[PDB]
Design a protein around this ligand. Structure first.
Ligand SMILES: O=P(O)(O)O[C@H]1[C@@H](OP(=O)(O)O)[C@H](OP(=O)(O)O)[C@@H](OP(=O)(O)OP(=O)(O)O)[C@H](OP(=O)(O)O)[C@H]1OP(=O)(O)O
Ligand SMILES: [Mg+2]
Length: 168
């Protein structure tokens, strides 16, 4: 329902989420997508009209989606879902070509993500989406492949900004 907050400039849906790392920073916590059960992503969701800051949304969604509690240790800034709309692929005008490069036809972002790095302090067996999702730790190498397979490079960008150890 329309508790959802949108960018006043681009109309993009405002979403906050967490890159949750182990204290030793060797693994990130990932969740299966609701719609597609074999796609691994990170906890995130729409900011609601009442919420005073993005941190609130981020920790609310990390609890609801992954039953994960911890402390925010870093602001990882913003990334955008630049997937085109659903009008695409049956459109006549689809790509815009340069001289030494090619691009998708100009469009506003679907979603503007505000990501935070969280140090995991606890994982609980019962959480709201307990029976709707799976939730597992993954090394950088394994996490990177998950987000490529999921078709979510913007979530990988968020992950790359974190203090996760990539040398493995
Ligand atoms: O298209 P869909 O309905 O199949 O689901 C998409 C997305 O729609 P879009 O990408 O076209 O905008 C959903 O947004 P909406 O449906 O609320 O508009 C989004 O929920 P979200 O943004 O996290 O919002 P919160 O409810 O957490 O606040 C959902 O994440 P999941 O929560 O895991 O399902 C996404 O699948 P993926 O993220 O890959 O798993
Ligand atoms: Mg969500």
């Amino acid at each position: 329902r329309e508790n959802q907050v949108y960018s006043p400039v681009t109309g993009a849906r405002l979403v906050a989420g967490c890159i949750c790392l182990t204290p030793d920073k060797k693994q990130v916590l990932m969740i299966t997508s609701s719609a597609h059960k074999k796609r691994w992503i990170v906890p995130k969701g729409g900011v609601e009209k009442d919420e005073p800051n993005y941190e609130t949304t981020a920790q609310r969604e990390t609890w609801e989606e992954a039953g994960c509690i911890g402390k925010i240790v870093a602001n990882l800034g913003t990334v955008e879902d630049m997937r085109p709309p659903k009008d695409w692929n049956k459109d006549i005008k689809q790509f815009e070509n340069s001289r030494k490069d090619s691009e998708v036809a100009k469009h506003p972002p679907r979603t503007e993500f505000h990501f935070y790095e969280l140090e995991i302090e606890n994982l609980l067996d019962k959480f709201p989406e307990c029976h709707k999702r799976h939730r597992k730790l993954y090394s950088y190498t394994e996490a990177k492949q998950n987000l490529i397979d999921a078709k979510r490079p913007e979530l990988l960008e968020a992950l790359n900004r974190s203090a996760i150890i990539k040398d493995d």
